[PDB]
Automatic annotation (TrEMBL), chains A, B:
<dbReference type="InterPro" id="IPR018316">
    <property type="entry name" value="Tubulin/FtsZ_2-layer-sand-dom"/>
</dbReference>
<feature type="binding site">
    <location>
        <position position="10"/>
    </location>
    <ligand>
        <name>GDP</name>
    </ligand>
</feature>
<feature type="binding site">
    <location>
        <position position="158"/>
    </location>
    <ligand>
        <name>GDP</name>
    </ligand>
</feature>
<protein>
    <submittedName>
        <fullName>Tubulin BtubB</fullName>
    </submittedName>
</protein>
<dbReference type="InterPro" id="IPR000217">
    <property type="entry name" value="Tubulin"/>
</dbReference>
<dbReference type="Pfam" id="PF00091">
    <property type="entry name" value="Tubulin"/>
</dbReference>
<dbReference type="InterPro" id="IPR008280">
    <property type="entry name" value="Tub_FtsZ_C"/>
</dbReference>
<comment type="similarity">
    <text>Belongs to the tubulin family.</text>
</comment>
<feature type="binding site">
    <location>
        <position position="122"/>
    </location>
    <ligand>
        <name>GDP</name>
    </ligand>
</feature>
TrEMBL record, chains C, D:
<protein>
    <submittedName>
        <fullName>Tubulin</fullName>
    </submittedName>
</protein>
<feature type="binding site">
    <location>
        <position position="184"/>
    </location>
    <ligand>
        <name>GTP</name>
    </ligand>
</feature>
<feature type="binding site">
    <location>
        <position position="146"/>
    </location>
    <ligand>
        <name>GTP</name>
    </ligand>
</feature>
<feature type="binding site">
    <location>
        <position position="184"/>
    </location>
    <ligand>
        <name>GDP</name>
    </ligand>
</feature>
<feature type="binding site">
    <location>
        <position position="12"/>
    </location>
    <ligand>
        <name>GDP</name>
    </ligand>
</feature>
<feature type="binding site">
    <location>
        <position position="207"/>
    </location>
    <ligand>
        <name>GTP</name>
    </ligand>
</feature>
<feature type="binding site">
    <location>
        <position position="147"/>
    </location>
    <ligand>
        <name>GDP</name>
    </ligand>
</feature>
<dbReference type="InterPro" id="IPR002452">
    <property type="entry name" value="Alpha_tubulin"/>
</dbReference>
<keyword id="KW-0493">Microtubule</keyword>
Amino acid sequence: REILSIHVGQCGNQIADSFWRLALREHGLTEAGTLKESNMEVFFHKVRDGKYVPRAVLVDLEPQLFDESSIVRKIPGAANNWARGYNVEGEKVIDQIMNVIDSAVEKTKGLQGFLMTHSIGGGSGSGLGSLILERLRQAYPKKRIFTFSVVPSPLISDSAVEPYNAILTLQRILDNADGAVLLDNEALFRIAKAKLNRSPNYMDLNNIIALIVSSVTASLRFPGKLNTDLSEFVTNLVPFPGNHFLTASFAPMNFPDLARETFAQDNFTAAIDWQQGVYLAASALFRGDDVDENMATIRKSLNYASYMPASGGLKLGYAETAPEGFASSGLALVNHTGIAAVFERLIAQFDIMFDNHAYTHWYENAGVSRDMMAKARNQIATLAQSYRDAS
Amino acid sequence: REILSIHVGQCGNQIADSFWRLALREHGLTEAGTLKESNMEVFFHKVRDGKYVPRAVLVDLEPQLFDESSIVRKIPGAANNWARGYNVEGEKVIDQIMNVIDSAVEKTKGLQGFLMTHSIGGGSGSGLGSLILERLRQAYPKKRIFTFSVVPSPLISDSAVEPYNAILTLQRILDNADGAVLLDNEALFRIAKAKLNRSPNYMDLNNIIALIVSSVTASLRFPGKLNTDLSEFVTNLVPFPGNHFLTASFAPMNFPDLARETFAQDNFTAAIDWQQGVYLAASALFRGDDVDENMATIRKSLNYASYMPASGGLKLGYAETAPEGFASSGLALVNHTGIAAVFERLIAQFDIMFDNHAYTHWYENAGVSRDMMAKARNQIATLAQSYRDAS
Amino acid sequence: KVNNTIVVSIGQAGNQIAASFWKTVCLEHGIDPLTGQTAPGVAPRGNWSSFFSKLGESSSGSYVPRAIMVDLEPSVIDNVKATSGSLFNPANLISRTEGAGGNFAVGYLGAGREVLPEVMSRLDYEIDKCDNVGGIIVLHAIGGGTGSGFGALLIESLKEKYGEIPVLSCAVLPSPQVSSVVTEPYNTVFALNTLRRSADACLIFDNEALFDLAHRKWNIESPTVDDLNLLITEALAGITASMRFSGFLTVEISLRELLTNLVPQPSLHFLMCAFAPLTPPDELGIEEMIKSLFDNGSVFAACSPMEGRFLSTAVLYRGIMEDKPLADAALAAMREKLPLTYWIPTAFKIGYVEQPGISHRKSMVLLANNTEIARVLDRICHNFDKLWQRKAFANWYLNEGMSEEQINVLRASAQELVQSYQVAEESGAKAKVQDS
Amino acid sequence: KVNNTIVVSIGQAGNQIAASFWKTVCLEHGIDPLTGQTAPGVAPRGNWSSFFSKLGESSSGSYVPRAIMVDLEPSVIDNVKATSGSLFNPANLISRTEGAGGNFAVGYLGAGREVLPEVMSRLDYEIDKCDNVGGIIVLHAIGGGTGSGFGALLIESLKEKYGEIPVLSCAVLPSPQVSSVVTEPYNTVFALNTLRRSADACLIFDNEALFDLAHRKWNIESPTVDDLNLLITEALAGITASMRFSGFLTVEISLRELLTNLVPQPSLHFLMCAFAPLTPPDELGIEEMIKSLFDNGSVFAACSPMEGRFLSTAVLYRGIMEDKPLADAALAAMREKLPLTYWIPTAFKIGYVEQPGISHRKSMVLLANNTEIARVLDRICHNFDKLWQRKAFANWYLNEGMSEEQINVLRASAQELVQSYQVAEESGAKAKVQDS
Ligand SMILES: Nc1nc2c(ncn2[C@@H]2O[C@H](COP(=O)(O)OP(=O)(O)O)[C@@H](O)[C@H]2O)c(=O)[nH]1
Ligand SMILES: Nc1nc2c(ncn2[C@@H]2O[C@H](COP(=O)(O)OP(=O)(O)O)[C@@H](O)[C@H]2O)c(=O)[nH]1
């Protein structure tokens, strides 16, 4: 039940750092991976009696200690171009990235699958990120692949071409991942904004994320009973192969208060269309300080599509070890049809630019024609339409 | 026949870098210690079939790859005070320095001895350097200890208090080392000065040194027959326990030209009093491109003390691998009574300052009384007088 | 590991600007601009590997610009050699004797056809010693004969042989208050066509604007081309700073990154730039500087960006660190008053570099792809017509390689470019169609 | 890993200088001097750990000076709090109400005897959060009551409880053109005794000199204590730069290192300092600056170092990097014209720091232990006598703790110090004997 984690790109490794940070403190390991005095060998790697190293590969990193034999320094070239990352520049390094990964699973008794932390708006995390997602499937067909993908939002964007990279990558996340957590900047923004009087900075957003990760990953690295393995994540949240795009929330930012906050619109990390959107599959996980009781109480709060059975469709878990800084916290993974919003948004943006030949050429001269791009959009459009009609 | 190398202080590690640099290129190893395609396991450590790591401990280093488990980062405090390094500040870290060393000899089948690269004018390389020299003897009594010590010269000094540290350290080099190569700044200066039209900088001097090291160390790491082990260095150059202070030269900066240059006053790295000074024990070592012939020819050039036997007293060696940048080079280790000069110099300087209570207090308030200092001088004074009367 | 940038400076003006640039950058990085040497034992400030090359291995090692200077007349290169010490690589200073007689034709297909070989040989060399080449900046004055002629010639062969490498042209446009040949509009229009078709982006330096500026904001009775040239440097230095020095969250912004953001369409890659503070070489507050960056009298182009649309902007600060909050706050406000298009809703790059230049403790450069550039291009086309209409001096060019048909087409291209941008104000879809 | 330095500023002047210092350093390192914050995601320039402390752990983290401000009157600390935002640690700004009435006695043994406790508590705190404490700089004006009184008191307890820590006092001497109490010579002479016996070195800031300077080299009609204070900062910043920023071959020069070199004998630890460039806040070349450092009208002390002997020198540049060669060459030449002693033949420290201040792209500070300081000390002793002779105002001090015998001894010490240095010109051996 070992999970290899792959972080790619600036945003990819930025999350890596932050997450693996508390990743240790939670499991109580030192800056170097020792006991400063549970089944954790799922994320960390036991080297010797009391030594552990993070089961993770840092791909395309450009600035603490991970196995620098399993981390690849970035080679200039990706830019903000997806096509550039998935081809010209990715090619030069995909074979290597892959060996570095495979050599990390070699020292893996029973591999479960992978986790990928990256940004779908850049060029490294999107382009190269997609290429990896692809060759990762074509190599470990039986393994599960999960994603922590940051979606871009104009209210904190640095590239004009983002939505293009967004759509392109979303296609590969759709065709190769068993599930993806969409960390929406538009949401991460708003959250951080009203949480800290001044205009947010990538770090602030980066925080919310780090927590969301640890909390989502928790159940996989702790003794609990809910979402023991990525596989359970699937059977519990993906009501169908294609629709595997989830949202996650955090609480907080009492218990009735926690369970209330955990399932509070404003508390989620995604712009889901809470109005004409309906639930499909939920999952709460509280950790810290009588849970298998208020379950039915909550399900009456949430409104799933009609065809779903009244009671059930929602499972609640627990972990005694809460994230540092809290006595006990929440987290809610929800496969909600409102997630269609996020896609539709990206589409709309895409369309304007694309229909005017916005920056289309930088992509074509890089091995990504407008038709290929259009296909990418048309596909993601359907994916969203899909979620929409399911409501 | 393994030799552990210990570099302490700025000047100590500065030499380390430079030396270990060509240390690889000579043995043809890569930046990381691999074969880019002799008995070398004397300096480098075979980790695996084709992997080698430098047998050396970096003590008190403050900025490439050595075993960072066997390198100790400096802890602020030494200043330019010997007393400060040998006591207050050295104490805090001597125990550790020692374990780091002993753990390096643990993975040593048959340890020969140590090499120490440092400066006798600073406070780290002199103070702490002396403390190490001491505890190194009190721990490996049967082992041989050799030193590459840089003597300070006003024509490129940065501290007023240098000669004090000079004398203090020279006492420990006298009581604990089996031999020491005095790299005189006054000489290194003059050499570099007339070798490069403009006023010399620590790097330039640092160069001459690096070569001097490799060349001196050569015979210990190459298949040759002369000076196979530090022990031979002794029986071949130290005509008596106390008088173990040597000078080394380099050539160049034809063969008759090389053998001429190698044994050329101006070509040595020490201010020895070539006038009223006489040879005691010499040793030449040419490397690159008919040597056991011009031996007797050379000995008639050199003038040893009378009591020494005409032919003999000089041995010549050879190594096929020359230092990078040369087709073939020289090097001459000479135990010459003129070396007394260097000491006398330091003494004189000491005296002026000391007799006026120059900076004596910084030493007393640090556990080094004037009497202790005086003893240090008085002893080194004798050491020199010794060499002098031996002529 | 960082991207490499080679700077080929063609012509006289190009080379004079280039010389200044290089001395300035040398000083920013802590390198003697006459010896290529820096403090013994340490490496130059920032990512010197970017624009400089390492020669030697010790500390006696020198650093040498990744630059090539080409010119059909010795007057300037010869002087650079005199004034630059052992800075540059001698074999990278290509020069000739006869000159080009202010003839695009001569430089494009004739006398310049002879230097191409040597010049290319040098590129191949500088291109190879690059760990990661990532852009070639061609610095030249599109108004004369060499810079316009060889300029175009060199950019075209540079995109045929190589091509995976981005090429940013920094074209100095000619003006009345400094003209040197009645045919400046011929040469310009001709070189424009190539700039338009073979470069990845052209940063335009309009001398008229430079003159006014050096005379108004710097208030110089009668500005010399040297005065004008200093401003061009301040910018080149300030733009390239994002490559030579490290940011807060990024270590370097690539010319590629920078360009893929500013250039939405192939024939819409003609950039403008503004600077601040513009204080005569004889202090202002962040807020004022940001505000002034968008004044109509601060762009190094004779137009009014504010009366046009911004297709894509890029503000690049340096010196700004602690005060960042306030700085963003201001630029943020500014961003609202800016005229944008509907088809490129958002495109506003912002970059910070801790290290300041040798001139101001805090400064900033505006790099903008604005439509009022079409106005500048028109002015050129007009004058081109005043001459071509009467066929003045045509013979010099005709009897040197060109033809009437060839000349007309070039003029035609220039037109397409101009209309293309105008349309762009309204629609990107249309601006496209105008490209044929 | 680097050494830590805590700066306790006692009194009014001390605290006013301290406030300026801290704002300046804040700006040099890229830290907002009102919030202790820097650019999100990155750490402040240089070795901030040196003078600043890290608060928090993310990026919302702030940096706070390793400084303690003490004063028996609220007028100044209260103002610092107003003007410094959340910069300093509030619990590190000790203040009181009654004041010291220009009375060394009050501050030394009485009203100041009450604040000692709180002040010490704070040190213990700041001393502990230091990975490696390596010096405490007491910034104060030896001329008043608090700075002179508590100053001495605080330095004496600081060397009893701690003592393994070096203490450098930066004592501002009083002058006619700015005096505030007829008894300045009493207070000074009194505090001197402690400075002499309990500090590791005292860097003297003579206000008379500062006045002339601010009026001559900076040409200010009538200089304010604020004008005078700015110069003191320029130096403190420039001296401490060798600790806050990294060198070429060294990462930091310790106050300890710096001092063990300058101070040959216990009672010969009274330093002087000179600065360059001294250009009014309205450019010079390295060579000129080095030359000017040794001019008799550039030292922040009313004397002529050149007419005396240099016991030990220390030139500290910053901004100088590429141009180092020329710089060394000059200072080297200067070094020959300098008057030295026979018993301290060579003692000339030189330090470089790449990072410049916020004022000059290139600058330098001369820190010298010269004998003409004996002349300054004499002037003090004289005036002391003009008063004590007639016993003017003695009563205020007598009836506040002191005695005639105690007062005479102090005056006696001051004498020993003065003669001690004079002798030093001739012999160090003798200068010693004069210490008892
Ligand atoms: N900014 C600037 N413009 C120049 C300079 N020299 C010439 N120009 C202008 O640019 C045009 C080309 O000049 P030049 O570079 O000498 O042309 P070339 O050497 O024949 O290619 C002229 O018509 C001038 O208006 C210069 O040093 N700086
Ligand atoms: N350089 C300088 N000297 C000052 C300043 N304020 C006062 N002085 C001088 O230093 C002496 C002490 O003043 P102050 O620091 O107020 O004394 P205290 O607060 O009673 O210790 C006075 O007699 C003045 O000559 C100031 O801000 N700067």
